[PDB]
């Protein structure tokens, strides 16, 4: 009832983003205008947690500073914002030990693995947690899900499992996440004699946000087995691996919630925050001071935004500050940074522009992310799928085919920068 | 005036019940009549249906009960209604409804309500067809909470789609019993299911009549509890129907609707009585008492006796220092005199004797019992 | 006495309905039942299904019907027909298009001049059933519909109130042919029929915007089209629909948006109503319980209550008299015309 705290593993969908985050860390990486990990905050924020933890490897110097000089280590801040380095490929569990063996939890926990973009109150769901806990200690975690249909867009794979609730107590009683192949639903009988009404539930959104109790960083430390929160901590604790411990569930029927955990999320979220679902965390809020403003058909403009005449920008559209459109030119369905340049009769489909692109005349630009200061050159074809990363510069008349990924640096992602770019790729 | 066909027409299924063994090995008097508010297990499908409209009904029985089940039709049936008795000879022990509903499947022409005779329903009969009128389904199915037994039967797994009224998982909840399994493509197609344990199948169903013939022509279903298992709506289902889709739906209230299949008729029975002064007909002494307690006619109880939250039925009398508590009693039954029978059912035509003391004890047709005590058993006479 | 009119400008309001089959009178066809429950349950259909339905049952009740030879079939069908009415009024009040169609009925009941052998009279009659149904609603609605759809331009966006069949032709027609343009679906309390509008629209691609009634002055602006499809009109030019209908029109007005009155001519009727409130249909007062965002899904509410509560009385009617002079035109099978010239056609019939 007092001072809660939340860990947040950052870092935890690095690698998923690779080509880009090769330069900046997946948690800063811009939404809609927006640094990824301040939804994160913002919703930390509004449950009322008191103290922050965030898990982080990868580039944790770009993360440690840019929580320095946010607005979040401020004295006016709702919690206190603490990182903790660790190594490659953190596991969530590994974090959980290493709070046990530092010995940093107290009372209950909010626990999150990625980002999270959420208008969802945690207040009244930490109330029925603690009142479930007061004279059972052996409810350990209420995992926060969120109500929707079987083949909801923001419903993924990682988000698609089958929940068994008990109806009125709200206890989960099995759980195991969809995944075709296994074409059934089986759970012991005996379950049936101990509860008396139960809930088979596929259309239910596993967010992944959870509340937990003082035993679990004690208790991964015991089960030092566990890696996965879900198919080794849950389903330990309903196969009674882990001995006589109740698990539950809190389903939101109302708001929204969701985790920026891969390419498509990031894609399907950043549509859902375009569309007012995350309320108040909408562009035209203005939370790091901008200057945007809701339009109809949610197309977000921010001020000194220069469109000239007979360019037209259809509906679901953001514009950064200080862009530029060029004549004859169509955007409909994108995301643009700040100080970008759009040149003269260009089509832009349902695109990813971060900040600084520059893109020349007769451009076709759909389904793609463009990371800071990309160049693409005069009449050039960007199609679905593509991802290119910071500092690229695409040369005059390139086409890059679906879902190639080009970087800058020095790996696994096809093809750097200078034109015209891959193929003759000045690449080293 | 006739001007409106025939919606439904009833047919009632009454087998003899190898549960209620120790009252029913009878062919002396079936178990479609064995007693519970001092009216024949018969009476309340019966009563039920005449409430609900219908005039007509079909009584598939057993050739052995056949004799009975017609004399009790003519003289003592309350309810000013007709029933065509046809007991097939086909059907034996070996069997249960749905076959009992084949053996007679010339006779069903319209959309048909199935009852059974040991259906006690209180649940009013407007909501059952009008559901099945508004729904329109192949299929719907009664279902209620199990009892509540305040006295000293495998459990039911009902799966429903709430809101709809679907019907999705119908498996006995012992059975199959290794493993309960849910086919993922049940979760595909209607993703939120309620399960209940806490109900128990109240044997009321109303079929299209489509149905009559999915029993003619599939000859392994045997009772429909085994019958509304295999509807499936949502499987590959190769099994050539001729006959937009198929819907089974289900229905539950909290009032009084069970089935006296099991030892229930000892709680249905308690729970038959809410009702005013006990009947005039029947002679009771002064030197004695009885109350709240149901005693049918021309039986007679004599003194210094007593009869404490009992039943008893006609034909009887009771008497020389009696202690009959929370027991049933049913037809020609000579109490000997000045017995216990406490939390006790007696079946008809039997003489208990010369002190017999039974708690917790079923005693059968046209069985003597004599000095005795005994606690557990269910007796007798031999072989 | 059977009368009630007081204080309350409610008062007079039929509120009595059948929900159940209880008691129900014996001489009922098994037709009629299930279509008195159709008709006080669903949520789904409204004045043009309703009398499809109406004639279609009538004719098994006359087909099933049989001659008792003390009469014969003109003095005494009228009277059993009389019997199904009075049991369907009872568990909903009569459409105005069931109205219609039920003086229709009766009186070819009983032009039929002590002619033929029942059975042929059984048979022309379901005939102009078959043939009222046919020209007067079918034939009459594919009129209206092409008549309807070619007033719309490529860029319109049209705005439609809730669930109307007549206005949900008239669009998915529209796009079929080729027409660019979107369509603005407004929804209202208690029910939200616009749901299924805007499931049924968006299912045959169309480009779709949703809004509650409270947001009309906004999406207005967009709008350049209203269409609106009708229970009745009313003969002084009057479009008698459901219970927003007329704020529609009448912000539509404001923002010169034209008012398009999409209505079959047998929905056309003699009454004259000068309010909303005299002629309309009490809605069940719990419906406007539950908390918004759905309906029938359990929310208990503050209001619950209120049948005990002393002082509060919880209200929804179905109907709205829109007037004449925020109706720009009427269109029916006989053409694009002023609503006002609706007591001319009558005569035409």
């Known amino acids: ?428 | 005036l006739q001007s409106i066909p025939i919606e439904f027409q009833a047919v009632v299924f009454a087998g003899f019940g190898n549960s209620l063994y120790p009252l029913t090995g009878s062919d002396a008097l079936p178990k479609a009549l064995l007693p519970i508010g001092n009216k024949p297990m018969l009476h309340y499908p019966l009563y039920w249906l005449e409430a609900a409209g219908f005039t007509s009904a079909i009584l598939i029985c057993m050739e052995e009960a056949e004799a009975h089940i017609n004399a009790w039709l003519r003289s003592g049936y309350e309810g000013h209604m007709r029933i065509h008795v046809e007991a097939p000879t086909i059907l034996d022990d070996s069997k249960s409804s749905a076959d009992a509903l084949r053996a007679v499947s010339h006779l069903i022409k319209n959309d048909f309500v199935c009852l059974s005779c040991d259906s006690i329903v209180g649940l009013p009969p407007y909501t059952v067809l009008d559901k099945f009128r508004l729904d329109n389904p192949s299929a719907l199915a009664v279902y209620s909470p199990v009892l509540k037994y305040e006295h000293i039967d495998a459990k039911q797994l009902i799966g429903i789609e709430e809101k709809t009224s679907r019907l999705l998982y119908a498996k006995s909840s012992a059975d199959v019993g290794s493993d309960f399994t849910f086919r993922m493509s049940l979760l595909w197609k209607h993703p939120r299911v309620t399960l209940n344990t806490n109900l128990s199948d109240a044997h009321i169903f109303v079929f299209k009549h489509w149905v009559i013939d999915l029993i003619r022509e599939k000859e392994s279903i045997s009772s429909i509890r085994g019958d509304l298992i295999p509807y499936l709506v949502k499987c590959q289902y190769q099994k050539s129907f001729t006959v937009a889709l198929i819907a089974k739906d289900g229905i539950i209230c909290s009032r009084a609707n069970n089935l006296p299949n099991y030892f229930e008729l000892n709680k249905c029975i308690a729970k038959l009585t809410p009702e005013q002064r006990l009947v005039d007909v029947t002679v009771s002494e002064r030197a004695l008492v009885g109350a709240d307690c149901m005693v049918n006619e021309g039986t007679t109880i004599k003194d210094n006796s007593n009869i404490k939250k009992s039943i008893i039925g006609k034909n009887c009398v009771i008497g020389k220092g009696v202690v009959v508590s929370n027991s049933i009693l049913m037809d020609n039954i000579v109490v000997e005199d000045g017995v216990r029978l406490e939390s006790c059912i007696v079946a008809s035509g039997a003489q208990i004797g010369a002190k017999s003391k039974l708690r917790e004890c079923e005693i059968g047709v046209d069985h003597r019992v004599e000095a005795g005590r005994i606690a557990r058993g269910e007796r007798l006479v031999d072989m | 006495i059977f009368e009630e009119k007081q204080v309350s400008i409610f008062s007079h309001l039929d509120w009595r309905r059948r929900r159940t089959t209880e008691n129900i009178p014996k001489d009922i066809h098994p037709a009629v039942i299930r279509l008195g429950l159709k008709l006080a349950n669903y949520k789904i259909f409204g004045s043009n299904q309703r009398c499809i339905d109406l004639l279609k049952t009538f004719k098994i009740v006359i087909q099933d019907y049989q001659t008792p030879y003390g009469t014969t079939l003109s003095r005494h069908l009228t009277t059993h027909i009389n019997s199904q009415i009075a049991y369907l009024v009872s568990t909903r009040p009569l459409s105005i298009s069931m109205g219609n169609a039920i003086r229709f009925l009766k009186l070819e009941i009983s032009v039929l001049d002590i002619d033929l052998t029942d059975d042929e009279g059984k048979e022309l009659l379901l005939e102009k059933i078959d043939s009222y149904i046919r020209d007067r609603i079918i034939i009459a609605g594919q009129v209206i519909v092409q008549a309807a759809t070619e007033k719309i331009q490529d860029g319109d966006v049209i705005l439609t109130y809730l669930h109307s069949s007549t206005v949900n032709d008239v669009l998915i027609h529209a796009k079929n042919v080729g027409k660019k343009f979107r369509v603005v679906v407004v929804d209202s309390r208690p029910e939200f029929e616009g749901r299924v509008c805007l499931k049924l629209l968006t299912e045959h691609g169309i480009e779709c915007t949703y809004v509650m009634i409270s947001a009309l002055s906004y999406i207005m602006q967009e709008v350049t089209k209203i269409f609106l499809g009708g229970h009745a009109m009313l003969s002084n030019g009057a479009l008698y629909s459901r219970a927003g209908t007329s704020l529609i029109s009448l912000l539509g007005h404001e923002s010169n948006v034209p008012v398009i009155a999409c209505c079959e001519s047998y929905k056309f009727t003699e009454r004259i109503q000068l309010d909303s409130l005299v002629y309309n249909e009490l809605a069940p007062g719990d419906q406007l319980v539950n908390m918004g965002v759905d309906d029938f899904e359990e929310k208990p509410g503050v209001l619950a209550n209120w049948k005990s509560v002393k002082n509060l009385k919880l209200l929804s009617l179905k109907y709205d008299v829109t007037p004449p002079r925020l109706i720009t035109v009427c269109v029916c099978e006989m053409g694009l015309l002023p609503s006002t010239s609706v007591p001319a056609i009558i005569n035409e019939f």
């Open chain 1, 1 to 428: 009832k007092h001072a809660l705290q939340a860990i947040v593993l950052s870092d935890s969908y690095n690698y998923r983003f690779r080509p880009l985050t090769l330069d900046k860390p997946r948690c800063l990486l811009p939404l809609a205008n927006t640094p990824l990990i301040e939804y994160t905050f913002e919703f930390l924020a509004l449950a009322g947690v008191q103290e922050v933890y965030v898990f982080c490897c990868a580039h944790a110097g770009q993360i440690r500073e840019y929580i320095e000089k946010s607005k979040w280590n401020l004295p006016s801040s709702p919690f206190s914002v603490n990182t903790i380095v660790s190594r490659e490929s953190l596991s969530v569990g590994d974090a959980l030990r290493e709070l046990d063996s530092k010995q940093l939890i107290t009372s209950d926990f909010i626990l999150v693995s990625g980002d999270v973009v959420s208008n969802v109150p945690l207040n009244e769901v930490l109330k029925e947690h603690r009142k479930r806990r007061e004279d059972d200690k052996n409810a350990i975690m209420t995992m926060v899900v969120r109500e929707a249909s079987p083949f909801h867009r923001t419903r993924a794979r990682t988000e698609s499992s089958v929940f068994v609730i008990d109806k009125k107590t709200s206890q989960c009683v099995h759980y195991q996440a969809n995944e075709r192949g296994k074409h059934y639903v089986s759970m012991d009988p005996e379950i049936f004699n101990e509860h008396e009404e139960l809930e088979v539930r596929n259309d239910l959104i596993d967010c992944q946000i959870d509340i937990c109790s003082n035993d679990v960083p004690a208790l991964f430390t015991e089960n030092f087995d566990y890696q996965d929160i879900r198919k080794d901590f849950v389903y330990g604790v309903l196969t009674s691996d882990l001995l006589g411990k109740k698990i539950h569930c809190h389903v939101a029927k109302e708001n929204y919630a969701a985790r920026v955990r891969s390419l498509q999320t990031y894609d399907a979220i950043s549509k859902d925050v375009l569309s007012r679902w995350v309320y108040p965390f909408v562009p035209d809020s203005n939370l790091l001071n901008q200057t945007f403003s809701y339009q109809r058909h949610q197309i977000y403009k921010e001020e000194d935004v220069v469109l000239a005449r007979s360019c037209i920008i259809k509906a679901r559209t953001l514009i950064g500050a200080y862009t530029k459109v060029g004549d004859a030119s169509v955007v409909a369905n994108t995301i643009i940074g700040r100080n970008c340049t759009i040149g003269s009769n260009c089509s832009i489909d349902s695109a990813f522009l971060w900040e600084d692109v520059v893109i020349g005349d007769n451009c076709r630009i759909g389904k793609a992310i463009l990371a800071n200061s990309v160049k693409i050159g005069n009449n050039c074809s960007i199609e679905d799928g593509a991802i290119v990363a910071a500092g690229v510069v695409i040369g005059d008349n390139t086409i890059i085919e679906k879902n190639k990924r080009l970087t800058t640096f020095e790996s696994h992602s096809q093809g750097t920068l200078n034109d015209p770019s891959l193929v003759g790729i000045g690449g080293r």
